[PDB]
Design a protein around this nucleic acid. Sequence first.
RNA 1: GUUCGCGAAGUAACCCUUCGUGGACAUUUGGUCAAUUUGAAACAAUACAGAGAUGAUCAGCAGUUCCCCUGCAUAAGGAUGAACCGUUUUACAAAGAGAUUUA
Lengths: 50, 70, 292, 261, 193, 193
Amino acid sequence: HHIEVVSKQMDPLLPRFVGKKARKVVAPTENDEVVPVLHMDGGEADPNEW
Amino acid sequence: KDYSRYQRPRNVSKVKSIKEANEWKRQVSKEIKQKSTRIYDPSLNEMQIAELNDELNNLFKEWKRWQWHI
Amino acid sequence: DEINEPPPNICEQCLGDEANIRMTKIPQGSECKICTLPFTLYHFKTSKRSNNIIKTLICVRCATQRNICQCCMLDSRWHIPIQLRDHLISLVNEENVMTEEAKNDMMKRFLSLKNVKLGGAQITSDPSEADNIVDKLKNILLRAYASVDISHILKKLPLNESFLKNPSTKSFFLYNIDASIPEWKITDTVSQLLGIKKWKDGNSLSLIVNHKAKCGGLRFQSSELGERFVSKISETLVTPKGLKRGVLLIDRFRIFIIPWSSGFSAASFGTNTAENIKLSLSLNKLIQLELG
Amino acid sequence: MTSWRDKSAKVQVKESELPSSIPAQTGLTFNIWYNKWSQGFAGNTRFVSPFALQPQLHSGKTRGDNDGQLFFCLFFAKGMCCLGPKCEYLHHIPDEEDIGKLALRTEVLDCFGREKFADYREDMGGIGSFRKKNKTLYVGGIDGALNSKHLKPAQIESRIRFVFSRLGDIDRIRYVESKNCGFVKFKYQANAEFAKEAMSNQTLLLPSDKEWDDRREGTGLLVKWANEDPDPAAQKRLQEELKLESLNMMVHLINNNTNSA
Amino acid sequence: LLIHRKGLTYLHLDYNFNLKPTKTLTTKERKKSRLGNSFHLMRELLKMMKLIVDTHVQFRLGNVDAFQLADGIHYILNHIGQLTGIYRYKYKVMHQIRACKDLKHIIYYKFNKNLGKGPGCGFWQPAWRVWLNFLRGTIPLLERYIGNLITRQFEGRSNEIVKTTTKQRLDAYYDLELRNSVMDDILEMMPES
Amino acid sequence: HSDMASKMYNTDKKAFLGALKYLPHAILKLLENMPHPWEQAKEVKVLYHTSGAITFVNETPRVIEPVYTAQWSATWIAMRREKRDRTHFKRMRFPPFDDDEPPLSYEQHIENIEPLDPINLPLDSQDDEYVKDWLYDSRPLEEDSKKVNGTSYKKWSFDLPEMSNLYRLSTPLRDEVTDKNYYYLFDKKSFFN
RNA sequence: GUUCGCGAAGUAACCCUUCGUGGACAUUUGGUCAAUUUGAAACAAUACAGAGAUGAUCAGCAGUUCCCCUGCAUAAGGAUGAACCGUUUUACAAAGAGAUUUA
Ligand SMILES: O=P(O)(O)O[C@H]1[C@H](OP(=O)(O)O)[C@@H](OP(=O)(O)O)[C@H](OP(=O)(O)O)[C@@H](OP(=O)(O)O)[C@H]1OP(=O)(O)O
Ligand SMILES: [Mg+2]
Ligand SMILES: [Mg+2]
Ligand SMILES: [Mg+2]
Ligand SMILES: [Mg+2]
Ligand SMILES: [Zn+2]
Ligand SMILES: [Zn+2]
Ligand SMILES: [Zn+2]
């Protein structure tokens, strides 16, 4: 099906974007791959000075 | 329909109508629910249950009176 | 992304038969039925002269996660509802697949923004993973109250009279009706038998069936139809005392009839649910006494 | 045909006889945006519908029959349609020919054209859900509809059987004397959707009755959507008909793969 | 319509655009019904507009002579500070109110040369031009203001309100930045755990 | 759209509410096209929303500046003659209507009546013969093809007797100074200094 | 309906009337929306309590939050706007002694 997409002539007095509200959304995290936390090994001896 | 100004009311004879009495009767059951909830408490004080216990005897006697009229 | 958005998912049978369709795009139109979050409302008409606007009810993210079109919300392949789709895959994988939906507005919005597929939307939208399960559907086709005082009621049920031509009655007593076999199926079988089809216009027959008592009755207007109902029924069962009973014949079921010779009304079968169960329990013996 | 296609639809209510658009006053001032009353205590705000559908009387050809309308007139079901034969929507009981036209359309919206919702309303009233193909109605509020007549238990059910039978093919009717409510199941969802709006806020008074002059004073009967049937005698019926629906679809679906190959 | 959408049915908007409560309000209702400048500055513009339109109505009904119409319009434009109350919500209008007063001194002592003190002067053309130029500059103001009000009705207010720093809270924001810098520098000196 | 109580008006109520930002522009277009005192009535060209929300006066009032000066100058003379010989001038009461009564409809009340005479100086025939036929029109010489370009009403052009006649009527409101040496230290260059 | 032709009848004498017939002119509105209860504003009232740092009485300003409300607002106010005041166990080892087992 070849489908022509047109825009409707909006009423200048009715609110454009009728589904647009000020609402709040929490977003999920897309964690597909684990990022390796590539630290080095370990000068780790420490007295009670800290 | 309002009736807040009108007593419970302890007198029964004054209102002939039963359909109006249908509303007066809930006016009593509601208190039965409030105080009834007010019967069990963490403190379980004798003085509070004791007054509530008297209110329960007074209400049950009223239920006997409504049953007797019928 | 508000400047890079997918094209809408619509069925072929929503678009219909015509070639070119003028569709109207509103960039933040209505909000989605599922996730309650705004989207680009597309709406269109099948022909130019039609009289029904076909709107997209859900957003493309809710349409992708379920693999459904936005307009009729049927599956993009197989064109079936979602509840029937997830049931057919359940008989193949032998485990329950199900798309579950949140009742919570913060958890309707949360569940849409994730890029997963839900339910049978992993099986569908993969053509290789859908055709082989249709092949696995094909092997499945290769398989292809003793305390009650009921005695006031059973005097009024006939239970002792015969299904002959000679009585001329309006009403009949149908017993041995299963808890299946819906009230419309018994009126359609009688009206198919008489050719008095579209009976609800003229009100030729009126039928009451309890479905707890497993019993019922059907009333006719114009008693001359009663001899047409008697004569168009050929098969009968004779109880070994006598007293022949006709059989209505719903597919695989058998429903016995006796002329009531009065109007039974409602409440003849029972006036309480606990009371009606014992009348089915009363009858079950008489059916076994009629047959064996 | 003889009952419906022979005649044309008639005007149920004159446009001067139509009810006032402002509701009955339950407050101090009227609110113009939300067409309601504001500074008020409360109200039952449910009343008996003054109008009712006589199905064999009011049905007829409409403007939408010639135009090829799919959707039924809402105010025909309420018995309130002032347009009559000039009305854009259909004026008859749903039939197998009518619902077969709606078969692509019924999945998302009712027989009146109104869009259905994701989940049901809290009190099981309203239009309906598209996730469940519900064909069973909760007939409630019978005490208000009867006007409080005792009426026995079998008689109340018999009234439900007489009125709802005019509104389409019925699968079963169950009345529960203890719960004082009935459950009416139709053959099609479009007859349940029509009979829900038809019998909302109606009475069962049957004018030979003494009350018939005080049918308006009562509360009215609630027809809302029904829940699932809890007994396993009918639960096992549900998985059996779902099994038969599945086998009827797999035969239709292997032929689609036969054409696809 | 706007008052009644906000649930403020206990406020009556008169036909002369006077806004008065219909009862003694609770403090919660006084918080809710406290309209801002853009409502009242819009409402006072309609009070000014109707007051001028009503004199042409009174002229057209026959109740008012054409000289009284010219004097009536001249009275309105020179007494907007006492007939409307527009200064309460946009106090820059006191330039325009004092311009129409200063124009009236120029017009009267040229009109009333060899005439007595009396009402009938209706050379309202200079004071008309003042308010037409006042309306020239408040079109962009009230389109921004009432446009923010109506979109806050239809959509609600945004949840991303970031407060700028101010004299009011500069001692509060200083310590938040001071505590974070100390908490960073110690956590980096720490060996572990 | 008086009693918007039906469910059909739910869309039109949003149109009334979203037009409130455009209302100050509708007050500027209405007040600039206000009738001058020498006019009984004035037909204005309007633009209106189809739901009856807003009504803009879709014209701009353009005049011939020598003609317009002479029209206000003749009413200047006509109103000083009025205040001279009137025994008592009754200024009207403001506001001209009570705030409980609604604005009464144009057609039931205003349109059926004869208007009244406006402020017109009698225009002596031997001294004012070139202007007396067209001076107090709504748009003077609008359909005269030689004095104006047309009914778009731009770019006028007059002859010498008509131009001197407007000069003579305008002597209450003209400049009356012909030398620029009057404005020696009273020009705007000295005002800037 | 108009206009350009064509044909026939009558009046005419090639013009008019009449009705047959080709062209030309003009060519797809509207709805995301149906008219009181069942697809959703909200206050008020009744009852029960009753204003943070406290020993008592008085100013506040922030922060965290999947709470917002007034307001033109990135100003300010909403009790310092409210909620915050609870519940709290394993990254766990190394040494040194008496009872009960095991085979
Ligand atoms: O009381 P006065 O000092 O003599 O002044 C009055 C007064 O104007 P001012 O007080 O500002 O000068 C009048 O205005 P109101 O304050 O009473 O409204 C004004 O006439 P209006 O009332 O119509 O404005 C009147 O002018 P006139 O009497 O010439 O028409 C004018 O008197 P002056 O002529 O002495 O200025
Ligand atoms: Mg404080
Ligand atoms: Mg404070
Ligand atoms: Mg705070
Ligand atoms: Mg604050
Ligand atoms: Zn969605
Ligand atoms: Zn579809
Ligand atoms: Zn209709």
